[PDB]
Design a binder for this molecule. Structure first.
Ligand code: 89Q
Lengths: 198, 194
């Protein structure tokens, strides 16, 4: 069930694949990033091939596609992180139990940005000791979403009289979304790792 | 890929099925409980049929069987909870975000007698206590400690290859803690009284 464009892994479960500039795959990610980070320079873009994370994520997507019926449940978003976090995210994905309190909090979960410029802030993509910054391009199952609130440990219910039927994620603003928060494992697949510098 | 002992769900994805007293499945689950809790009165046992939770759980079980290079990754454990949390656990399973002296995960007991304490299975206004029988992917485990947010690494020369769960005592475990969604499937709900 692994995507057929992935490199052969020789029955290995995990692989990072360096992309070539001028390939459509590299160029689409570069254009998405430079739309709002034209003042930074990309060192490299690696495709993340993680069989187990992919499998769990694709099971969740199919469940949300069945439950929501005729919705675009997936967006491509950005996530800046520190170099210390990269090994863990590459193997295990995004753990809400490890998430920082955001400067504007819409709930206790993992935060993903619409614009690379948000994730490019030193507060999220902290420069390592060689001055490299790290940002993931992430498939996120945002599904049906509402404006979040600082107290949330799960998405709120759609209906107060049915407390277990939940929104899929929350946002800062439903009309003009700039960030999404997710509260469950395997709701986000880290697809690419951008390494960049001033 | 829904198990054989489940009953038909008329094309729905979630239902709670009351077990018939005196039949094989009811007798099997009652005996697990009464091993340590024979002084308690059983009102009913329900089979939890949650297609989505089962699917996600089965994927994690297949992945752990590959990673550990053997079966024997699954244990049947108990979880006592309050009446107000029962609809959430039936629909969404166990959530670490909702005493945590062996880590910030979900706690499961080897013995029903431990989960039957009023501190976990809080009596509701009518005296009814609630306990799940849970399939748990305990896998390879180590001793836990306060403040863990994931299990420790097997070798701190490879800090991303983790233990699957933690316990109070590795030689004679009486409880297990898991730190990831869909590492536990709530299989039966026992309603009982002191
Ligand atoms: N909810 C439960 O059934 C349960 C709760 C706690 C527990 O271990 C607590 C540990 C001694 C500190 C096991 C099970």
């Amino acid at each position: 069930n692994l995507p057929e464009h992935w490199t052969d892994m020789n029955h290995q479960l995990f692989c990072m694949v360096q992309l070539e500039p001028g390939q459509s795959e590299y160029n689409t990610i570069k254009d998405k990033f430079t739309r709002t980070c034209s003042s930074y320079a990309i060192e490299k873009i690696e495709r993340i091939q993680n069989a187990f994370l992919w499998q769990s994520y694709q099971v969740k997507k199919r469940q949300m596609d069945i439950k929501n019926d005729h919705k675009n449940n997936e967006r491509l978003l950005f996530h800046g992180t520190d170099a210390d976090s990269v090994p863990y995210v590459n193997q295990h994905g995004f753990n809400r139990s490890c998430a920082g309190k955001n400067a504007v909090s819409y709930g206790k979960g993992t935060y993903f940005a619409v614009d690379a410029s948000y994730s490019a802030k030193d507060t999220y993509s902290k420069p390592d000791s060689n001055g490299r910054k790290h940002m993931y391009v992430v498939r996120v199952l945002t599904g049906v979403f509402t404006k979040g609130r600082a107290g949330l440990v799960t998405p709120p219910p759609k209906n107060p009289h049915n407390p277990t039927d939940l929104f899929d994620s929350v946002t800062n603003n439903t009309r003009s979304p700039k960030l999404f928060v997710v509260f469950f494992d395997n709701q986000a697949y880290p697809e690419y790792l951008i390494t960049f510098t001033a």
